[PDB]
Amino acid sequence: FLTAVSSIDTFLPVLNEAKLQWPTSALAASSEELLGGYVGSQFYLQDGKYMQFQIAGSSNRCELRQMIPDGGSEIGWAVDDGTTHTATSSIVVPEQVDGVEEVTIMQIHSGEAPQLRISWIRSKSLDGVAYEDFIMSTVRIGTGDSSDNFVKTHLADRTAGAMSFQIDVKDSKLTITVNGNVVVNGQDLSFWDGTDSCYFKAGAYNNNPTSESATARIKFAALAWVDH
Numbered sequence: 001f002l003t004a005v006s007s008i009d010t011f012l013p014v015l016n017e018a019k020l021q022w023p024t025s026a027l028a029a030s031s032e033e034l035l036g037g038y039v040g041s042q043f044y045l046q047d048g049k050y051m052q053f054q055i056a057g058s059s060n061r062c063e064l065r066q067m068i069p070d071g072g073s074e075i076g077w078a079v080d081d082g083t084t085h086t087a088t089s090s091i092v093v094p095e096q097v098d099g100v101e102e103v104t105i106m107q108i109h110s111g112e113a114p115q116l117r118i119s120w121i122r123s124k125s126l127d128g129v130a131y132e133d134f135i136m137s138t139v140r141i142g143t144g145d146s147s148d149n150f151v152k153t154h155l156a157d158r159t160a161g162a163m164s165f166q167i168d169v170k171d172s173k174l175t176i177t178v179n180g181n182v183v184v185n186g187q188d189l190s191f192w193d194g195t196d197s198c199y200f201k202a203g204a205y206n207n208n209p210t211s212e213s214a215t216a217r218i219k220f221a222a223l224a225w226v227d228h
């Protein structure tokens with residue numbers, strides 16, 4: 001059978017601080033439900049150790065959304081609140097099925113927009129360099145959809161093995177570390193000063209697939225939100 005992620009202890013700390021959105025942002029299961037054995041094809045314990053997310057369809061998701069711990073409501077923090085907000089993970093990104101083109105695996109999001117997406121991307125050119133099968137950051141420095149609103153960075157090429165991530169926000173600046181290596185340091189987030197509705201997300205958010213049936217699949221070996 002499909003084993004529930006909460007059947008082992010590894011992910012209980014983060015499940016106590018998250019709700020699960022699936023298959024859209026409007027349909028969710030509570031932290032209490034996650035700790036209480038929530039399971040399905042979209043979210044189950046794979047290989048006895050991975051919190052595996054699976055989703056098909058354009059702009060569908062299976063994604064954890066940060067919550068106040070111990071049954072609390074939605075969290076909202078600010079990039080300039082003085083606190084350090086940190087999300088860490090260890091992720092196995094398997095080879096993706098044909099038709100899956102981009103999968104957002106971690107975010108900083110607010111009430112109205114994504115400050116940061118970390119995504120696996122099948123193919124994209126950045127600053128006149130074509131990359132394939134890679135991990136990218138997209139940071140919003142504005143609210144519009146023209147390219148000047150974003151800073152996009154090649155972080156790493158996808159590996160067969162687990163890849164660690166750390167996202168740190170402090171004093172309106174962002175640092176991203178991948179496999180222990182800094183890949184973005186001190187990126188400005190001050191456009192978002194005063195936005196007090198920010199929160200972390202992680203899982204699988206399927207962006208711009210070429211087939212509605214192709215299932216994105218992301219395996220988390222570890223995930224944590226922490227505050228300092």
